[PDB]
Coordinates of C-alpha atoms in Angstrom, one line a residue:
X35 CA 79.4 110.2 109.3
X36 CA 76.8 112.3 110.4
X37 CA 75.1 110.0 113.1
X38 CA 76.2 107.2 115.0
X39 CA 78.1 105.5 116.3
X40 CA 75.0 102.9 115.7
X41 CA 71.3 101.7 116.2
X42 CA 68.8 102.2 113.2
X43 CA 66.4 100.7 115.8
X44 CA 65.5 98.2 113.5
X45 CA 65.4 99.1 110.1
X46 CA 68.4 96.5 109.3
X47 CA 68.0 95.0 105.3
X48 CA 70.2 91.8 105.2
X49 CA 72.0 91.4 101.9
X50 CA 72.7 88.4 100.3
X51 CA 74.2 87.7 96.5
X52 CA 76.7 90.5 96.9
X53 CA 80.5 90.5 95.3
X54 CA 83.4 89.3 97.1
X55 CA 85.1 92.6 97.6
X56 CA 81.7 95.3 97.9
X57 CA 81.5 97.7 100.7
X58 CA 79.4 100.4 101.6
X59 CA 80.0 102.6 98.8
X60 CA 78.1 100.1 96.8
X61 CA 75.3 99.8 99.0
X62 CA 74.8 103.6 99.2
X63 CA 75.2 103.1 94.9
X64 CA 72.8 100.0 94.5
X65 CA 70.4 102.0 97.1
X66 CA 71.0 105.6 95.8
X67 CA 67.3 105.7 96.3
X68 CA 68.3 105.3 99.5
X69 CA 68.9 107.1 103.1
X70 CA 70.8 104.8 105.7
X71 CA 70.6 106.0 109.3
X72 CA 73.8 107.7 108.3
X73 CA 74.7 106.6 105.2
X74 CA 77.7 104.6 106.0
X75 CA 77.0 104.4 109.8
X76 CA 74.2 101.5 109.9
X77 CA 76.2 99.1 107.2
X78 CA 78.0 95.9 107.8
X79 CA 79.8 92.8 106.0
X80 CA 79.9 89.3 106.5
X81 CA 82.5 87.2 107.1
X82 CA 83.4 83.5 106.5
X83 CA 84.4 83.7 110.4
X84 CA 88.1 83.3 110.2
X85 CA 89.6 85.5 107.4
X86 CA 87.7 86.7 104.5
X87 CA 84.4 88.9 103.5
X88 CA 81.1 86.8 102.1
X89 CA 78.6 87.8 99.2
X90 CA 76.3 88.7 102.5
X91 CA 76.0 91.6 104.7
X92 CA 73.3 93.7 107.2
X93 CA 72.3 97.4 106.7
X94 CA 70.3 99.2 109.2
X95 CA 68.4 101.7 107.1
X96 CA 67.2 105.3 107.9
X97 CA 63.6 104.2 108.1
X98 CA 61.3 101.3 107.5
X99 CA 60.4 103.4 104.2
X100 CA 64.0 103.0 103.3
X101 CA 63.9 98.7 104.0
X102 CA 60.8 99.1 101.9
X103 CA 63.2 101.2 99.0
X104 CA 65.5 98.5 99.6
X105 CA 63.2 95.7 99.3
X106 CA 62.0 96.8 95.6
X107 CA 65.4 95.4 94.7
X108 CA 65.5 92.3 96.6
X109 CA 66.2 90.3 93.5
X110 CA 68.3 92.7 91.3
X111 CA 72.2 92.7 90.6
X112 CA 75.1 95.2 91.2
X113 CA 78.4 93.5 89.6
X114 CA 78.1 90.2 87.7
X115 CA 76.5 89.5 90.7
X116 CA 73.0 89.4 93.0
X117 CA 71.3 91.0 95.8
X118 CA 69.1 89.7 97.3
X119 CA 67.5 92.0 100.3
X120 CA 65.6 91.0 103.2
X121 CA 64.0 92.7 105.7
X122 CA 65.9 92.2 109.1
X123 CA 66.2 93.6 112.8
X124 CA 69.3 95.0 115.1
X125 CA 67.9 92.0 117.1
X126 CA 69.1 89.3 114.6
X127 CA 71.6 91.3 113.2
X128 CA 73.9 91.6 116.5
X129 CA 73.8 88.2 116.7
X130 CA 74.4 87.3 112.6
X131 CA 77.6 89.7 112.5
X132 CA 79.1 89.0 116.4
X133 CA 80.3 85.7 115.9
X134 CA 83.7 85.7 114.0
X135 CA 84.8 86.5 117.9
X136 CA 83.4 87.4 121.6

C-alpha cells in the first residue's frame, strides 16, 4: 500500500506449486529478495472458479529485475510445498485471474 491500485506493466511472475491457504505475506517471504510494484499491490490467487483458492497464483513484480529475482527460485519450496515461477504478462494475467465471473 504505497502504489496502486494496479499495473506493474508487465512484470507479472505466475506461481504454481504453492499451499492451499498462502497469500501475499508469503510471496513477499519466499521473495524477500524481492520488490513487488507495491509489495502487496501487484499480487493475486487463483481459484478453482467456484469456491476455493488453488496452489497457483500471478504477481506483477516491481521490475523485470525483480521477475528475474523471482525466477532464481522457479523450482524451490515454501511449506511442504513447491513454487514453481514463471515469467508472465498483465496481458495473460487479466485473462488467467477474470474468469471465476464477468
Amino acid at each position: 500500500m504505497m502504489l496502486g491500485p494496479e499495473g506493474g506493466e508487465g512484470f507479472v511472475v505466475k506461481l504454481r506449486g504453492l499451499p492451499w491457504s498462502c497469500s501475499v505475506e508469503d510471496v513477499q517471504n519466499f521473495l524477500s529478495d524481492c520488490t513487488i510494484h507495491d509489495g502487496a499491490a501487484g499480487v493475486h490467487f487463483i481459484y478453482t472458479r467456484e469456491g476455493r483458492q488453488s496452489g497457483e497464483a500471478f504477481v506483477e513484480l516491481g521490475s523485470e529485475d525483480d521477475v528475474k529475482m523471482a525466477l532464481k527460485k522457479d523450482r524451490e519450496s515454501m511449506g511442504h510445498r513447491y513454487i514453481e515461477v514463471f515469467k508472465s504478462h498483465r496481458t495473460e494475467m487479466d485473462w488467467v485471474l477474470k474468469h471465476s465471473g464477468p
